Chains A and B, each alone.
Chain A
């Protein structure tokens, strides 16, 4: 389905400047080192995002059920 790819694009969109500012703070001037750190941030962001999101849609699902299930 490749459904992860659209998520990455969307996550990267709202964190583009954030990851860039931090990468500049750690590796100023070194565009290559900046990109490498941004790549690490992008996947870690997705991992945390997906694990967190799953619990949120689950919380909504449990609230819709209220069946001790």
Chain B
């Protein structure tokens, strides 16, 4: 769904410290282990599977030849 959410939370002394680089707080919520499934584990089909000739063209020549000649008889043996 490509949803994006951002939140902010600040917990510090009321001395309104600003300018030095903040470091150390790293507390985020948890509901157990984070799994081992990664994130954004999606892909888009580009259908680039089967480049050039991923087949035996000679085997395909014989195969289509037989199918085309045989199906003509299934249609009717009154025209040979």
Contact of A18 with B64 in the complex, beta carbons under 8 Å: yes
Chain B interface size range = 10 to 19
Complex CA–CA separation, A40 to B64 (angstroms): 12
In the complex, number of A-B residue pairs with CB atoms less than 8 Å apart: 60
Partner of A10, one of B55, B62, B66, B67: B55
Stretch at the interface among B2-10, B15-23, B30-38, B46-54: B46-54
Contact of A9 with B50 in the complex, beta carbons under 8 Å: yes
* Residue B78 interfacial (CB < 8 Å): no
Among A9, A10, A41, the one with the most B-chain Cβ atoms within 10 Å of its Cβ is A10
* Residue A69 interfacial (CB < 8 Å): no
Contact of A11 with B60 in the complex, beta carbons under 8 Å: yes
Contact of B66 with A48 in the complex, beta carbons under 8 Å: yes
Find chain A residues with CB under 8 A from B12 CB. Answer: none
* Residue B28 interfacial (CB < 8 Å): no
Interface of B toward A, CB cutoff 8 Å: 49-50, 53-57, 59-64, 66-68, 71, 75
